Write a protein that binds this ligand. Structure first.
Ligand SMILES: *[C@@H]1O[C@H](CO)[C@@H](O[C@@H]2O[C@H](CO)[C@@H](O)[C@H](O)[C@H]2NC(C)=O)[C@H](O)[C@H]1NC(C)=O
Ligand SMILES: *[C@@H]1O[C@H](CO)[C@@H](O[C@@H]2O[C@H](CO)[C@@H](O)[C@H](O)[C@H]2NC(C)=O)[C@H](O)[C@H]1NC(C)=O
Ligand SMILES: *[C@@H]1O[C@H](CO)[C@@H](O[C@@H]2O[C@H](CO)[C@@H](O)[C@H](O)[C@H]2NC(C)=O)[C@H](O)[C@H]1NC(C)=O
Ligand SMILES: *[C@@H]1O[C@H](CO)[C@@H](O[C@@H]2O[C@H](CO)[C@@H](O)[C@H](O)[C@H]2NC(C)=O)[C@H](O)[C@H]1NC(C)=O
Ligand SMILES: *[C@@H]1O[C@H](CO)[C@@H](O[C@@H]2O[C@H](CO)[C@@H](O)[C@H](O)[C@H]2NC(C)=O)[C@H](O)[C@H]1NC(C)=O
Ligand SMILES: *[C@@H]1O[C@H](CO)[C@@H](O[C@@H]2O[C@H](CO)[C@@H](O)[C@H](O)[C@H]2NC(C)=O)[C@H](O)[C@H]1NC(C)=O
Ligand SMILES: *[C@@H]1O[C@H](CO)[C@@H](O[C@@H]2O[C@H](CO)[C@@H](O)[C@H](O)[C@H]2NC(C)=O)[C@H](O)[C@H]1NC(C)=O
Ligand SMILES: *[C@@H]1O[C@H](CO)[C@@H](O[C@@H]2O[C@H](CO)[C@@H](O)[C@H](O)[C@H]2NC(C)=O)[C@H](O)[C@H]1NC(C)=O
Ligand SMILES: *[C@@H]1O[C@H](CO)[C@@H](O[C@@H]2O[C@H](CO)[C@@H](O)[C@H](O)[C@H]2NC(C)=O)[C@H](O)[C@H]1NC(C)=O
Ligand SMILES: *[C@@H]1O[C@H](CO)[C@@H](O[C@@H]2O[C@H](CO)[C@@H](O)[C@H](O)[C@H]2NC(C)=O)[C@H](O)[C@H]1NC(C)=O
Ligand SMILES: *[C@@H]1O[C@H](CO)[C@@H](O[C@@H]2O[C@H](CO)[C@@H](O)[C@H](O)[C@H]2NC(C)=O)[C@H](O)[C@H]1NC(C)=O
Ligand SMILES: *[C@@H]1O[C@H](CO)[C@@H](O[C@@H]2O[C@H](CO)[C@@H](O)[C@H](O)[C@H]2NC(C)=O)[C@H](O)[C@H]1NC(C)=O
Lengths: 192, 192
């Protein structure tokens, strides 16, 4: 007979050394077998015939939790995707050269050390209040765990009075986590 | 190739809700498989290629821990016997009747509520400083968890001035535990 097995939470992001509670349940009344399989340490906190609640702990990297139940010789299962993350904590802006001749080129560069996963980190390069460029990571250019975005522009007369800045956004929403923002201190360019 | 697997401690007695650390080791250099199997909650505290140290917890009744390692497709293993215990905490002595005619019979009775395992509990019936009787439990007469020892004697003139008492001894030495003693308050008989 067709039965279901569910895991709450289906996905969740947690920081290094973090932990989480998982409720592994099924529609089967008397499961012959039932459990949450994981490579991490786990404590069955509580169970009933139709569910088991565990506390899984000390998560260091992405990992999958396998929740399963056997009903009349038939096994069903469902996984929970746990992701690790460290939010942008420092965002540095650099203008190269700091002194530029009007109408000539310069390089804006943004760097965010220690942030993961990087394939969910996007950096924005602003000028005053206009977005000049932005890029998501995760293809290799400083990828799983350390990123940088550099853009070239030409110095304009108005850059004598508008700030350049960068914004890091770690969107963990599709990984069961939230959205983290960190702005850099603004930097003005010296033009002549 | 012949290898060994050892568990420390080979046996241990612990109280209800207690816990213990187990060091599961082998002589095999690179075990393909290795672990401590148990029905209790367990935390791998630390490991090396030749050992795993776990903290097993919340022990409620006797239980066996299965320590195993696989070396080149061959499995070896060794168990650790965990016993639960609650030491004698109260020992009551009763003389029936309290007033006895010299040369006539009376019943000494000792009772120790809540003590386990009972097959390692021995009660002693003393008169002054002489052991009158003693019995080990574990055959059914109030057995796994609640015991009583009753003995009959004839009232003697000297019982007018010597105390009757009982001593409970829980010897857990063959179960990896220690030895617990609890005496009862002394009771004198009234003879006429
Ligand atoms: C957990 O992670 C796995 C790994 O990607 C996800 O599996 C994919 O799920 C989609 C949607 O059903 C399929 O199209 C893919 O083929 C699956 N890939 C694999 C390797 O199985 C799964 O969906 C994730 N679940 C959640 C809730 O995040
Ligand atoms: C774990 O999840 C299960 C499955 O959804 C929960 O079970 C339900 O719990 C509520 C309250 O106990 C009941 O109204 C439902 O009917 C229960 N369903 C079943 C099949 O028993 C359970 O409460 C959760 N447990 C914990 C500790 O979070
Ligand atoms: C959480 O996980 C980490 C990584 O597995 C554990 O760190 C190891 O700890 C041992 C023993 O304390 C050290 O000898 C290792 O060098 C550590 N490895 C790494 C990669 O850091 C940490 O101990 C775990 N925490 C708990 C409470 O089990
Ligand atoms: C950045 O701020 C400037 C204002 O200092 C914005 O300029 C606007 O220009 C548009 C079109 O010329 C007008 O609709 C607004 O009235 C102006 N705003 C102000 C405050 O003067 C500019 O649009 C803003 N850019 C972005 C991307 O928001
Ligand atoms: C921004 O300008 C810099 C500096 O002129 C460019 O860097 C040069 O790139 C070429 C092609 O990759 C290299 O061969 C040169 O050695 C680089 N110059 C120096 C001085 O190192 C860079 O390509 C530009 N980037 C963008 C995004 O416009
Ligand atoms: C460029 O950035 C600087 C640095 O934040 C801005 O200067 C601040 O401006 C406010 C409003 O006038 C003052 O109360 C602060 O004390 C200033 N801080 C410093 C360090 O000077 C400046 O407003 C920005 N310029 C533009 C054009 O947006
Ligand atoms: C753990 O408990 C088991 C259960 O009795 C003990 O197993 C017996 O061990 C003796 C000595 O080798 C054998 O003669 C018996 O046949 C075994 N019985 C069974 C059912 O296997 C074991 O010795 C105990 N170990 C310790 C250290 O207490
Ligand atoms: C667990 O038991 C093992 C096996 O006896 C211990 O390993 C020995 O530890 C000492 C010090 O580390 C060494 O001198 C021995 O040579 C080790 N033997 C091997 C095979 O490595 C281990 O120390 C114990 N671990 C804990 C945490 O108690
Ligand atoms: C230690 O083991 C006991 C016995 O398995 C656990 O007691 C159960 O606890 C649940 C949830 O707290 C209660 O709903 C049950 O009625 C209890 N059963 C019995 C027989 O007492 C106790 O929770 C365990 N402790 C830990 C920390 O897991
Ligand atoms: C109990 O105590 C009495 C002493 O009050 C013991 O009587 C002893 O009797 C033996 C043999 O007649 C003598 O060797 C001792 O000198 C006596 N002891 C004393 C203190 O007078 C009696 O032996 C003791 N019984 C036990 C079992 O120890
Ligand atoms: C101690 O004396 C008591 C009381 O006389 C004995 O109890 C009797 O035992 C018989 C045989 O089992 C029963 O049929 C009677 O009903 C009991 N008498 C009463 C009043 O209940 C007891 O057997 C003696 N025990 C010992 C160890 O000497
Ligand atoms: C019988 O038991 C009683 C109760 O312990 C003993 O009485 C004690 O004796 C000592 C020594 O003389 C006194 O310091 C205590 O205060 C007494 N307690 C009580 C409640 O009276 C008595 O010594 C024992 N009798 C025999 C013959 O051993």
């Amino acid at each position: 007979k067709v039965f279901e097995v569910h895991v709450r939470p289906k996905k969740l992001a947690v920081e290094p050394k973090g932990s989480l509670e998982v409720n592994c349940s099924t529609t089967c009344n008397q499961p012959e077998v039932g459990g949450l399989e994981t490579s991490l340490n786990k404590i069955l906190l509580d169970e009933q015939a139709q569910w088991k609640h565990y506390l899984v702990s000390n998560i260091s990297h992405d990992t999958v939790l396998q929740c399963h139940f056997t009903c009349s010789g038939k096994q069903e299962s469902m996984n929970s995707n746990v992701s690790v993350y460290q939010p942008p904590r420092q965002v540095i802006l650099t203008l190269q050269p700091t002194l530029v001749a009007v109408g000539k080129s310069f390089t804006i560069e943004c760097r965010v050390p220690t942030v993961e996963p990087l394939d969910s980190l996007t950096l924005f390069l602003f000028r005053g209040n206009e977005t000049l460029h932005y890029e998501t990571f995760g293809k290799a250019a400083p990828a799983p765990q350390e990123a940088t975005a550099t853009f070239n522009s030409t110095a304009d007369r108005e850059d004598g009075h508008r700030n350049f800045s960068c914004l890091a956004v770690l969107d963990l929403m599709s990984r069961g986590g939230n959205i983290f923002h960190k702005h850099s201190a603004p930097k003005m360019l010296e033009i002549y």
